[PDB]
């Protein structure tokens, strides 16, 4: 996996344009938000359990059939698996927020995720909904902490959804 700086530096040699003006501008823009990325990751790590618990409770509110008999969140075994996987998603999204690059998600979260979920019958719609709920809760916590320009926080979660959701149109 790579972070933003590593990918940009390697692309500098790959593309043959070296350290031109556009690369310098993108590097400066990225470095301007680095402290905010670290702060966002700190907030996510300090409130991980609360975020996951809130998101899973809201998911079971919006999908009451999940916890009913025959549902996928039926029994504490599957409930614990739900919580565990949502923690996985939150952890790797925090990693991607720090790195500024989505390669960590590609290599350690999304590679083979669809195969696993098809094998185990894990529904993807509720998975995307839970990721979006976690994203909303993280945004609420960041607004509470006083952060202002936190658009990049949307990038991992949304991206993950786009990678796991099926094609409808």
């Amino acid at each position: 996996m790579q972070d933003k700086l590593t990918s940009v530096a390697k692309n500098c040699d790959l593309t043959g344009s070296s350290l031109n003006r556009e690369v310098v501008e993108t590097l400066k823009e990225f470095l301007a938000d680095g402290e905010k990325r670290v702060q966002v990751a700190g907030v996510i790590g300090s409130n991980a359990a609360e975020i996951v618990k809130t998101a899973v409770s809201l998911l079971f509110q919006e999908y009451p059939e999940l916890v009913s008999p025959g549902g996928n969140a039926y029994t504490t075994r599957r409930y614990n698996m739900y919580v565990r996987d949502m923690n996985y998603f939150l952890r790797y999204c925090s990693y991607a927020i720090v790195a500024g690059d989505a390669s960590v998600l590609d290599e350690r979260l999304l590679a083979g995720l669809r195969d696993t979920f098809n094998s185990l019958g894990i529904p993807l719609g509720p998975t995307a909904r839970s990721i979006q709920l976690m994203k909303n809760i993280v945004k609420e916590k960041l607004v509470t902490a006083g952060m202002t320009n936190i658009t990049f926080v949307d990038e991992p979660f949304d991206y993950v959804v786009r990678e796991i959701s099926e094609t409808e149109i």
Partner: protein, 174 residues
């Protein structure tokens, strides 16, 4: 410590520390005076923080082993909280959470299951301690110390509060 972690990572891969790791070590060395000042501040405010947090905790959760009328249990609970504050000070000095993990986090749930202390009570106590630490320290000192208390809380926060499948009423006790 951070130096120990860098050395272990380098030795696992059989190589000298890279220039970036050396620069991180140099930054950590430069931050040492501030780290020591923070550790001293935390050490000097231990007793008062513990006392105020115990008061708040007993106000919040009365049905606890530390509030069962046993002086030994009360002393043990206050001692445990002081120990966790001491471990946080060790983490401040060491530059990472490894002292906390290696002394009071790995096996903590097993220890409290064996001793008999409910972990939600421990979590509420630690939330009270975190509130006291935030109240006493300056905003910068709190911003530097509170993350370790949040790290402690994250270990014993699941499963548990919050609960959302309810009407929000808390007076159902009868």
């Amino acid at each position: 410590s951070i130096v120990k972690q860098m050395i272990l990572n380098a030795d696992e891969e059989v190589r000298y520390l890279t220039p970036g790791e050396i620069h991180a070590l140099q930054n950590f060395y430069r931050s040492g005076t501030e780290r020591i000042r923070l550790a001293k501040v935390l050490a000097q405010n231990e007793k008062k923080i513990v006392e105020r947090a115990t008061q708040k905790f007993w106000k919040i959760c009365p049905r606890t082993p530390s509030n069962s009328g046993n002086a030994r249990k009360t002393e043990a609970a206050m001692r445990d909280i002081g120990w966790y504050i001491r471990l946080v000070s060790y983490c401040l000095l060491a530059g990472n959470e490894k002292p906390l993990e290696e002394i009071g986090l790995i096996g903590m749930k097993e220890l409290y299951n064996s001793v008999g202390i409910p972990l939600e009570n421990v979590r509420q106590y630690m939330l009270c301690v975190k509130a006291e630490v935030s109240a006493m320290l300056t905003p910068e000192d709190a911003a530097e110390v509170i993350p370790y208390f949040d790290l402690i809380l994250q270990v014993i926060s699941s499963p548990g509060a919050p609960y959302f499948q309810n009407n929000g009423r808390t007076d159902w006790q009868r």
